[PDB]
Amino acid sequence: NDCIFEVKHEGKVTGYACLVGDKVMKPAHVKGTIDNADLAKLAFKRSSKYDLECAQIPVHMKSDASKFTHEKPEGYYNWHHGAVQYSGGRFTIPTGAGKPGDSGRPIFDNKGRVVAIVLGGANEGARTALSVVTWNKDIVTKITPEGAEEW
Amino acid sequence: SVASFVLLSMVGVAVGMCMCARRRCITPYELTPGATVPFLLSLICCIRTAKA
Amino acid sequence: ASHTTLGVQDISATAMSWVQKITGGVGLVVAVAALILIVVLCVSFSRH
Ligand SMILES: CC(C)CCC[C@@H](C)[C@H]1CC[C@H]2[C@@H]3CC=C4C[C@@H](O)CC[C@]4(C)[C@H]3CC[C@]12C
Numbered sequence: 718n719d720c721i722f723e724v725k726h727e728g729k730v731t732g733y734a735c736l737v738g739d740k741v742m743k744p745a746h747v748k749g750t751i752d753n754a755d756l757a758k759l760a761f762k763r764s765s766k767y768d769l770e771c772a773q774i775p776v777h778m779k780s781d782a783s784k785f786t787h788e789k790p791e792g793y794y795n796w797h798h799g800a801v802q803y804s805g806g807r808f809t810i811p812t813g814a815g816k817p818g819d820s821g822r823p824i825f826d827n828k829g830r831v832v833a834i835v836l837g838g839a840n841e842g843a844r845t846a847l848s849v850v851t852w853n854k855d856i857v858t859k860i861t862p863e864g865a866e867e868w
Numbered sequence: 869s870v871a872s873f874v875l876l877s878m879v880g881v882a883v884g885m886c887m888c889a890r891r892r893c894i895t896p897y898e899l900t901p902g903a904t905v906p907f908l909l910s911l912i913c914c915i916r917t918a919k920a
Numbered sequence: 921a922s923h924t925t926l927g928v929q930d931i932s933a934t935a936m937s938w939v940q941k942i943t944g945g946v947g948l949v950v951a952v953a954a955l956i957l958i959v960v961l962c963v964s965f966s967r968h
Pocket residue numbers: 925926927928929930931932935936938939
């Protein structure tokens with residue numbers, strides 16, 4: 718819990734950055750400044766293919782980084798806004814749980830481990846489809862359900 | 869003129885029945901949910917994926 | 921002069937033999953770079 722750092726634009730909060738493993742990750746589409754000065758200053762790297770925005774954690778003074786896991790068994794997970802249902806190759810969320818500007822909040826498994834990072838969603842009808850960034854054993858991938866608009 | 873017409877018709881038949889082979893080889897993948905078309909097969913048959 | 925004026929490629933002789941080597945080597949470097957970029961792009965599109 719509480720491993721989330723706010724990304725603030727000039728006049729509002731635009732996104733959220735998280736400490737996963739040895740790296741701080743943020744959505745590359747979010748424009749703003751990291752709340753912490755040592756991370757806002759830290760030379761920071763960009764990849765638009767996965768819309769992901771990385772830097773290496775100063776692990777000497779950030780030992781609270783969350784732990785991760787690439788396994789994605791079927792079923793329910795935690796989103797700081799309710800339960801997400803991971804079904805098939807998709808994540809489904811109650812339509813009223815997420816709002817634009819809340820991107821960057823990780824998805825937790827039942828063990829408290831980060832499984833995926835929400836980059837956006839799609840107004841899906843009775844639910845909303847969750848466009849996320851997950852990883853396999855060695856590589857990252859981005860899951861983009863059709864119709865997903867930017868968050 | 870006859871030779872040009874015959875050769876152009878042969879080319880048209882070739883491309884059309886290549887399209888027929890494409891449709892026959894591709895339709896079963898577009899019927900199966902999930903549509904995990906291998907990338908090599910997508911390059912060979914020049915298709916777009918349904919899951920982006 | 922009893923001989924005729926000559927064009928760009930005509931006078932080139934063994935200097936042309938040399939620019940053949942230089943162009944071949946540098947264009948080979950360019951072709952290797954193109955192959956590396958193409959294989960990297962093909963691998964990249966396999967990761968979605
Ligand atoms: C790369 C190094 C080693 C050798 C390069 C030599 C080149 C630059 C030299 C070879 C001898 C030269 C040419 C010989 C003949 C002609 C035709 C004439 O109507 C205009 C000059 C022109 C076009 C010369 C221009 C410069 C030239 C092409």
